[PDB]
DNA sequence: TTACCTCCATTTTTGTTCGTTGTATTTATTGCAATTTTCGTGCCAATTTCTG
DNA sequence: CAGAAATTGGCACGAAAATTGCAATAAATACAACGAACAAAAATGGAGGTAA
């Protein structure tokens, strides 16, 4: 993970009852940005035709 | 007995929760007529034209065209104050639906739907409308010269309203088509080493069942399943090799080297009745290098041959496939002269049987060939 | 061949590696499971266990 | 033979109050079915159709396309309610497969098991025998005499093979003595409701006792109950067997256009099976002594069908896992009532975070 | 960069976390006086002395860490891998002390108690009491909502009882089961049942004609019955009972 | 670009229902208005969470469109959440605020001694708000302040009275907020959150519905607000170990010795030694978390004068514990006290207890046996939850039938209610057991023959003073169980309904209402079991009686 | 022990209840809650009670 | 209404009865094309009606006096 | 020794709600007699093609 | 702008081939598939004990 700079205190309700608040500058930095790959495959086959 | 050097994996887990697997159901699916009719309930119809409009998209195919006439379906309504008009009226409200030109009578009548949808700003909007609603024959047969003298427009115009015309969609119900066409498995191999094709059966097809003889009759019925089994793979397996065997030429050096064999051949190779081999060779095929072929494609009828024996029926289509195929443009070859070129490699077919091959291969005669 | 691959792919003590981080590897490959073939079942099992 | 009230017709819907409850007749279950079940074979394959007098048969459940005969010389709408010819099929909507069952015809009588393990057994408390010796009888292991006449011997006797020997050996034919299902259907038949109710009712308000008269209250309620409603006792052994329709037990549809039988069509097939075996044993009058075996394995079919595992070895079809019945369709947490009409899936609805 | 509840701690009992911040803010703030080294170019001797200070800082420890065996260039990249803060190790059962901590605290200098005063981003106002502030190690959970979110109005039903699919790759419908059911008669909703029950899942008419009244902007159901009753009836004649409606 | 303001327009008035699984229940099924946001996640009101026992750390809500008029109407009048404020089981409010709503309640309505600003005198709440904000004076001073308060007169009306109150300079802000018709003395105290609860239960039987559902919004306003301006955090300094712990144990040690050699000298056997050991252990950790409560609830302050006094603590544990936002007494006790005895998932209490708390750290003895309770605490939510959910569907379906279908069916029979005392202290009284029943018999005059109460009489809190005036120990009232009703109970006989305050109406469905209240707290608490950690809950099993009180002795 | 077979089959022991009831011919009135819920029709309860009076009415 | 409906229930005196009649209400003023009786504030069919019998307009008498007077009147075209 | 009551052994039923989910091998033939279907080619009529 | 000719298709001919009901089928030496069976609670039947 990522270290953060945290503080322990009430904020509006906006970290009731579990929730969390972030800044703005965490996602201005790509902190916790993540990279995600699929993979599609296609098929060609015989056929009767 | 080889290993398959790539593949596709299945997406899933390789093991389930313990617990079973519900019962098969299944899934709606939607289809051309599913839509057209969801399409008709959210319309303001009335009673009559609603029953009308179901009987219309009853009678509708999978590209998207109307197969019965309109006299069946104002005669399938079953009244008698209904008329001809209100029919047309409904089956004109129905054209109009998505995807535009449905349910119409041909190919004229569906480009005309679909070119009245356009804005007058089009570039050539009237020209096509014109060529579509009068001369269609001499646009298909590529006469280009006529239609600049009925049409009396230079060669700019007219190339781009051909171009509008190819611009359009000719089977307008296959957007919404099936979901995925379904695939056969191959029921038999033949492959080659030593010089030789070697035919074997498909492996990843054929499982040994376990054999349920512990708490023991019932076992002795079991056991007739398995050799009802025995010989029925027993005798696909010696069918197909006789017929690979009577077939080596056509395998290596492909068509043109096939021979006129019937079901008699085989029955008499076999040493059984001809009804068992026309049953075992329904609906199965064999794969090959070369392709996929039905096991019963290899019989066909023969002509007389000069020099003694027959030619098989697939041979000459091959032949006059391939003589068609290096023709001059300028002077297509013509079907007495294709008879006369053919008859001088001991091939003795008549006018008609060259004719009924031609159609059968789905080539233009000679005058709509020529360049 | 047949029972080999069918041991080694469709078994129930078989399982797809876990592989978000490298703990999630060495935490399943370090595993200890009761059941399986031979073993006890999630309805057989008890409670002392 | 009008196009607006045939579509208006076919939406209406049906007002009811009550819902009734009760047994089957063998008329009833001839009625119920649109045609007769005889091969076992599903979906015929050198041209993908189903059979004909098969589990899918066109011509006995319906058309498999809305509005075309199987062959094919009727396809249209004009031609509604028009039976082709030919193959026999009508032409009319495909959605009827949810609402057509058939039959079969049992080549021997057959017992119901849930009227015959359920405790308490109500064959059993009918006639008030042990279940013991009604299993006994049923599944061929001994004889039970239906009339003494002038023997010695009395009515719902056990025999064994030697003892039904000896007395044949003795007496002759002034006696009847059976097995099987047959016997128990001879034995219902020939009771009577009120005369029985009645001595059992003098029966009990003579002698003093509580066994006694708890058994003969549960015995008289049971013979009262049979009495008040329609129903006879000799329709709990089963002569015809009906069929679900097709569409509620699909085939499994596989890759390659291929499909494997489910757990309903696999049971039906075996019945199927057997049935057609002791019918030909029956017409080439074979020794007895195969038939009862024979008759037997007829009778487990049946009931592995109706209810698998209730009694004996469950079946398995593959994975040594049981093949889901009837029954199994009806109750627990995943039948019918708990699964589907009391909590079900809905559209207008999501969900989130 | 994150604020949190503390009334999450207490009523949780996993006190650890808090320690972590201490000693963490403790981390921190190495590296801070390491890092102003670095931006005013002070000489070698006074870092490596810094850091071999910072390093023999404890109560007994098990690790010996001797710089004199560094050459310069050893000691300015070990100084530049630590200018964004010291890592420390503390061991599951024999980890590091409140008295440690504090010392470490007092070396980097910061407050012992571990709380500073905070003020107001939006009124400039400073709170009241001091506020604890550290720095703690969070994770990102692989339960993104991209994946949880999902709605449906219409879709494909099954084929045997005409019932809604289940899941988002089936694009299927929420489950209404008992328990909604009994809440729904406890309020005495009978209208909002009913219309969950026959219009929403099974009335293969009624679906329809909903729709249709829904897209003319009339609001009203012409409920029928559900097809899983009718498919009930089928199964429990199958089995030889006769059941049916009457009157 | 247009269908966004179609959207908007077609959802302006259309309730959608909330559903969250599982539905233990009525509550679980709740509608609301929509607002359209920006996001890919639901936002909740906090006041409802309570109801659906919802958390924000991963929890999922299914979402439902009514489409009919009639499930509209029924959204917005009977499922809407402003309709829910009292609970069907209790008749208690369930929108009640906790968490940070009451540590903001009880931190700003509290006093200090010499505060900023002590002692002047403030002419009506908005002077305390102008001082407060301009930080002139604190937010605990304490001051005297013009207050004027509106009493409901006998024919419904509002009589103004002004005065002069001691109070803080909080509960002068927060008394802006409190609606006319209320008391003074409600706010004039520290608010806990029995205080909110019972306010709020206050301010419905006394305004109505309307100002209750303005009054929650801005309590819960107000409390945010307060709470995010005290800056109230939690450190390690906080929990304090009290001295005489270790001290407590040592002698519980000693005793447990005594008995063990008392197993060896044949005198006892194996199980009264075990038992004796449980609740020597028990009444020493009963003594540690006193000593440790009592140590942690009284600070030392300098008065004006100059002289020391002591007064109530601002410890963030103590004000977190005693306020009753978050946390129970028995997960407090384990930080700065002794962990205590541990139970196996079987039910049995170990021997062994743990003399550590989490401030100081446990050994690995005691993290070993300590997993006991954690493997108990575990196995309970995975498995002892079907144990309650069979008893719930049994409950369902054997009293679905049970609806209200008349009005009065005449019976004079019933049964006699009288208060439940249990030990020196009366654990209910007869005013909770008679509140909202009807009345079978005329109730006679506690000394006279002399009618009190007419019979066939709704007992509302009005009745049920007066009963408490003269000091009525029984009362006769109607129940169900004896009902003249054909297939159904009368309103009569069943009485007031539970979530409206007015009697019931015809058509309800009680028996589902019934068997969901008894239903849902066996399965709660069965999956609340985890939080105290697998602790042992046992009391020492006393050896005598003790009387508390002068009078009498009868035995039966 | 109820009156009614779909209260009961729907409830527990599916293949008992629906053996005795059919031999006992049974009849079924759906009264209760949940025999309306099984066929989709208004309960007999709140917002639905009124309705269900004037059918009886009716009847 | 947009709130509680506290007063319509007092109106009314039951609250299954008031889903009823506004209901009735709701779908007269929807697919009948009745003007309502107080001005609407871009409201739908449902609050209007709340709001109504809010202000005493509208009950089970009123729309039963209503519907018996309009069908009168359709008798006195009739004839 | 008579009928009546009681305790031991075997059988049958049940065990929370969402969200995630997950199976395959192909399955009877087999010989006739009659039947129906289809092959090569002839013959004449109705287009296209041809120069004049 | 025209009638004489190439060209292609519908109809027809015997005759050879592909397709369908309809009674009629095995079958032996040999173990070896499993699993290994939960906790309570209620009901019913059978062996034993008892009032008389
Ligand atoms: N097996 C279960 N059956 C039903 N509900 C369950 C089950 N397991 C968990 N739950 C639900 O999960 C909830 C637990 O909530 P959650 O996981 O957010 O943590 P918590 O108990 O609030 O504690 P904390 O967040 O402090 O760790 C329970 O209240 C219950 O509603
Ligand atoms: N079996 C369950 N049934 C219903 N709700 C559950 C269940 N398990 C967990 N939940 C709820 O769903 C939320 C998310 O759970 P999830 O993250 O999947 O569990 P975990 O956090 O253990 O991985 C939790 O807050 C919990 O309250
Ligand atoms: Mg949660
Ligand atoms: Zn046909
Ligand atoms: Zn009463």
Redesign the interface.
């Known amino acids: 993970g990522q270290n953060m700079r945290v503080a322990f205190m009430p904020w509006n309700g906006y970290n009731f009852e579990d929730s969390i608040l972030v800044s703005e500058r965490v996602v201005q930095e790509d902190r916790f940005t993540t990279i995600h790959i699929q993979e599609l495959a296609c098929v060609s086959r015989d056929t009767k035709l | 007995d080889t290993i398959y050097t790539a593949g596709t994996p299945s997406g899933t887990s390789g093991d389930y929760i313990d617990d079973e697997l519900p019962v098969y159901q299944g899934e709606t699916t939607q289809t051309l007529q599913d839509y057209l009719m969801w399409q008709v309930e959210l319309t303001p119809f009335s009673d009559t034209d609603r029953a009308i409009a179901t009987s219309i998209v009853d009678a509708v195919d999978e590209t998207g065209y109307l197969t019965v006439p309109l006299e069946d379906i104002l005669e399938s309504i079953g009244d008698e104050e209904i008329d001809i008009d209100e029919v047309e009226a409904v089956l004109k409200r129905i054209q109009r639906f998505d995807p535009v030109g449905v349910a119409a009578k041909d190919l004229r009548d569906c480009l005309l739907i679909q070119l009245s949808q356009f804005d007058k700003t089009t570039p050539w909007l009237e020209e096509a409308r014109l060529i579509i609603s009068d001369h269609l024959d001499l646009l298909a047969n590529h006469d280009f010269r006529t239609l600049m003298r009925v049409t009396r427009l230079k060669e700019d115009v007219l190339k781009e309203a051909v171009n509008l015309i190819q611009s359009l969609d000719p089977r307008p119900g296959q957007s919404i088509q099936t979901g995925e066409p379904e695939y056969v498995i191959p029921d038999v191999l033949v492959r080659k080493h030593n010089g030789h094709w070697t035919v074997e059966l498909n492996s990843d097809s054929i499982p040994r069942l376990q054999i349920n003889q512990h708490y023991a009759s019932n076992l002795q019925d079991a056991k007739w399943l398995i050799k009802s089994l025995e010989s029925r793979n027993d005798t696909l397996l010696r069918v197909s090799r006789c017929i690979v065997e009577q077939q080596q030429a056509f395998f290596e050096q492909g068509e043109e080297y096939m021979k006129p064999m019937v079901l008699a051949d085989i029955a008499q190779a076999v040493e059984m009745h001809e009804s068992t081999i026309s049953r075992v060779t329904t609906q199965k095929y064999l794969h090959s290098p070369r392709g996929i072929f039905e096991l019963k494609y290899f019989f066909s009828s023969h002509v007389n041959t000069e020099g003694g024996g027959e030619a098989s029926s697939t041979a000459i289509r091959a032949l006059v496939k391939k003589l068609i195929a290096a023709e001059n443009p300028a002077k297509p070859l013509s079907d007495s002269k294709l008879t006369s070129l053919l008859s001088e490699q001991g091939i003795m077919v008549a006018r008609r049987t060259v004719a009924k091959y031609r159609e059968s291969l789905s080539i233009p005669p000679s005058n709509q060939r020529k360049q | 061949s047949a029972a080999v691959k069918e041991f080694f792919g469709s078994s129930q003590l078989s399982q797809f590696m876990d592989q978000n981080n490298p703990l999630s590897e060495i935490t399943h490959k370090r595993r200890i499971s009761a059941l399986g073939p031979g073993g006890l079942t999630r309805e057989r099992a008890g409670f002392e266990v | 033979k009008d196009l607006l009230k045939f579509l208006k017709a076919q939406t209406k819907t049906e007002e009811f109050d009550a819902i009734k409850i009760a047994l089957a007749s063998p008329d009833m279950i001839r009625s119920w079915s649109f045609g007769e079940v005889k091969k076992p074979e599903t979906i015929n394959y050198r041209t993908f159709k189903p059979e004909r007098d098969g589990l899918f048969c066109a011509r006995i459940f319906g058309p498999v396309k809305d509005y075309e005969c199987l062959c094919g010389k009727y396809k249209r709408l004009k031609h509604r309610g028009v039976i082709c010819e030919k193959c026999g099929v009508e032409v009319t909507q495909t959605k009827v497969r949810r609402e057509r069952m058939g039959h079969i015809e049992l080549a021997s009588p057959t017992a119901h098991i849930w009227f015959l393990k359920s405790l308490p057994s109500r064959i059993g408390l009918l006639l008030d025998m042990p279940l013991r010796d009604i299993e006994r009888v049923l599944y061929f292991e001994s004889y039970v005499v239906i009339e003494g006449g002038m023997t010695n011997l009395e009515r719902q006797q056990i025999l064994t093979e030697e003892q039904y020997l000896d007395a044949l050996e003795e007496f002759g034919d002034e006696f009847d003595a059976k097995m099987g299902a047959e016997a128990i259907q001879a034995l219902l038949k020939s009771m009577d409701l009120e005369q029985e109710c009645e001595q059992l009712r003098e029966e009990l308000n003579e002698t003093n006792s509580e066994t006694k008269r708890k058994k003969l209250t549960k015995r008289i309620k049971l013979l009262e109950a049979f009495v008040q409603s329609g129903n006879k006792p000799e329709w709990m052994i089963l002569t015809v067997l009906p069929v679900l329709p097709p569409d509620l037990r699909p085939l499994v549809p596989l890759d390659g256009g291929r499909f494997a039988t489910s757990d309903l069509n696999d049971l039906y097939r075996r019945v199927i099976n057997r049935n057609n075996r002791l019918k030909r044993l029956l017409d080439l009058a074979a020794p007895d002594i195969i038939v009862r075996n024979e008759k037997r394995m007829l009778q487990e079919a049946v009931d592995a069908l109706l209810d698998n595992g209730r009694r004996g070895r469950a079946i398995t079809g593959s994975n040594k896992r049981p093949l889901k019945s009837l029954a199994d369709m009806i109750k627990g947490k995943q039948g019918r009532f708990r699964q589907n009409l009391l909590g079900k899936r809905v559209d207008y609805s999501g969900r989130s975070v | 960069d994150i604020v949190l509840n503390p009334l999450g701690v207490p009523s949780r009992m996993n006190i650890g976390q808090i320690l972590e911040t201490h000693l963490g803010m403790a981390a921190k703030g190495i590296g801070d006086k390491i890092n102003a080294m670095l931006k005013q170019q002070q000489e070698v001797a006074k870092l490596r002395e810094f850091i071999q200070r910072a390093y023999d800082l404890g109560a007994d420890v098990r690790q010996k860490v001797d710089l004199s065996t560094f050459s310069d260039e050893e000691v300015m990249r070990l100084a530049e891998n630590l200018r964004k803060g010291m890592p420390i190790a503390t061991p599951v059962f024999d980890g590091a002390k409140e008295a440690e901590i504090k010392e470490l605290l007092k070396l980097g200098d910061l407050p012992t108690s571990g709380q500073i005063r905070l003020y107001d981003g939006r009124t400039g106002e400073q709170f009241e009491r001091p506020v604890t502030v550290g720095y703690m190690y969070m994770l990102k959970l692989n339960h993104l909502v991209d994946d949880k979110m999902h709605a449906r109005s219409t879709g494909s039903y099954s084929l045997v009882t005409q019932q809604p699919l289940g899941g988002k790759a089936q694009f299927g419908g929420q489950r209404f089961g008992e328990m909604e059911v009994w809440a729904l008669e406890a309020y005495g909703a009978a209208y909002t049942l009913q219309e969950m029950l026959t219009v929403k899942s099974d009335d293969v008419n009624g679906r329809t004609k909903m729709y249709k009244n829904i897209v003319d902007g009339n609001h009203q159901m012409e409920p029928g019955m559900p097809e899983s009753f009718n498919v009930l009836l089928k199964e429990i004649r199958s089995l030889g009972i006769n059941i049916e409606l009457e009157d | 670009a247009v269908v966004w303001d179609i959207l908007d327009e077609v959802i ?3 309730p959608v ?1 909330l ?1 969250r ?9 709740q509608a609301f208005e929509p607002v359209l946001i920006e996001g ?3 936002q909740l009101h ?1 006041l409802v ?1 309570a109801a659906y026992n919802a ?26 959440s ?2 829910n404020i009292l609970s ?1 089981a209790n008749g208690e409010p369930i929108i009640v605020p906790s ?2 709503v009451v ?2 309640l009880y931190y700003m309505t509290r006093d200090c001694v010499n505060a900023k600003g002590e002692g002047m005198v403030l002419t009506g709440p908005k002077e305390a708000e102008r001082l407060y904000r301009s930080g002139l004076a604190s ?1 605990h001073a304490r001051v005297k302040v013009r207050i004027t308060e509106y009493e409901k007169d006998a024919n419904g009306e509002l009589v103004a009275k002004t005065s002069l109150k001691d109070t803080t300079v909080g509960r002068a802000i927060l008394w802006m907020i409190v609606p006319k018709g209320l008391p003074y003395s409600i706010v004039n105290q520290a608010l806990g959150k029995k205080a909110i609860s019972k306010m709020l239960n206050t301010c419905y039987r006394i305004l ?3 100002p209750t ?1 303005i009054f929650a919004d801005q309590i ?1 306003y107000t409390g ?2 307060y ?11 906080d ?1 304090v170990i009290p001295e005489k712990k270790h001290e407590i144990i040592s002698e519980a040690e000693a005793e447990v010795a005594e008995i063990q050699e008392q197993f060896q000298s044949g005198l006892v056997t194996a199980g009264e030694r075990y038992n004796k050991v449980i609740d020597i252990w028990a009444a020493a950790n009963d003594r540690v978390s006193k000593a440790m409560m009592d140590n942690l609830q009284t600070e030392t302050v300098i008065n004006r004068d100059g002289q020391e006094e002591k007064q109530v603590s601002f410890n ?2 103590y004000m ?2 005693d306020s009753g ?4 007494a028995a ?2 006790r ?2 700065a006290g002794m962990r205590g005895l541990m139970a196996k ?2 039910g049995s209490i170990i021997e062994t207890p743990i003399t550590a708390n ?2 100081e ?1 446990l ?2 003895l005691q ?1 070993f046996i300590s997993t006991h309770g954690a493997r108990k605490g575990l196995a309970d939510t995975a498995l002892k939850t079907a144990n309650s959910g069979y008893l719930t569907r049994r409950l ?2 054997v009293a ?2 049970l ?1 209200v279908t008349e009005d009065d069916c005449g019976t004079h029979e019933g049964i006699m209610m009288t208060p439940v005392i249990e030990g020196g202290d009366v654990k209910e009284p007869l005013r909770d057991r008679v509140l909202g029943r009807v009345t079978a018999e005329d109730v006679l005059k506690p000394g006279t023959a002399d009618i009190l109460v007419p019979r066939n009489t709704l007992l509302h809190e009005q009745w049920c003073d007066l009963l408490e005036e003269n000091s009525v120990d029984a009362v006769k009232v109607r129940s169900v169980v004896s009902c003249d009703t054909d ?1 159904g109970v009368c309103a009569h006989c069943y009485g007031r309904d539970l979530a409206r305050g007015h009697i019931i ?5 009680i028996g ?2 019934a ?2 209240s008894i239903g849902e707290p066996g399965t709660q608490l069965t999956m609340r079991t985890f ?1 105290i ?1 697998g602790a042992a809950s046992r009391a020492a099993a006393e050896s005598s009686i003790q009387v508390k009180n002068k009078g009498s002795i009868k035995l039966s | 022990a109820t009156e009614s077979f779909i209260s009961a089959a729907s409830f527990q022991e599916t293949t008992r209840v629906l053996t005795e009831a059919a031999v006992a011919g049974k009849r079924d009135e759906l009264r209760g809650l949940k025999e309306n819920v099984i066929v989709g029709r208004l309960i007999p309860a709140g917002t639905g009670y009124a309705y269900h009076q004037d059918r009886m009415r009716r009847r | 209404a947009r709130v509680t409906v506290q007063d319509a229930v007092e109106k009314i005196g039951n609250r299954f009865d008031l889903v009823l009649v506004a209901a009735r209400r709701a779908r007269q003023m929807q697919v009948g094309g009745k003007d309502p009786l107080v001005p609407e504030e871009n409201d739908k069919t449902t609050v209007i009606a709340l709001r109504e019998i809010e202000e005493g307009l509208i009950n089970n008498q009123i729309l039963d006096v209503r519907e018996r007077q309009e069908q009168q009147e359709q008798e006195a075209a009739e004839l």
Not at chain 6, 21 to 29: D, E, K, S
Not at chain 6, 325 to 328: E, L, P, T, V, W
Not at chain 6, 505 to 509: C, L, R, T, Y
Request: net charge negative; with cysteine.
């Open positions: 302006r008035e259309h229902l559903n699984a599982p539905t233990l229940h009525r509550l679980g099924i890919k996640a639901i906090p969470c958390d924000f750390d991963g929890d999922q809500m299914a979402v439902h469109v009514p489409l009919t008029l009639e499930a509209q109407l029924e959204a917005r009048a009977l499922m809407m402003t309709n069907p968490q940070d540590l903001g937010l109505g519905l309307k559902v819960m945010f607000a709470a995010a301006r005290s800056g109230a955090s939690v450190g390690i300094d929990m963030s544990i977190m514990a936002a978050r946390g129970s997960q407090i384990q930080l998932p079987d989490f401030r750290g050994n690995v993290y369902v379906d679905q039938d609806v297939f109406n015809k058509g309800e469905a589902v209402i068997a969901q939080h950690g």
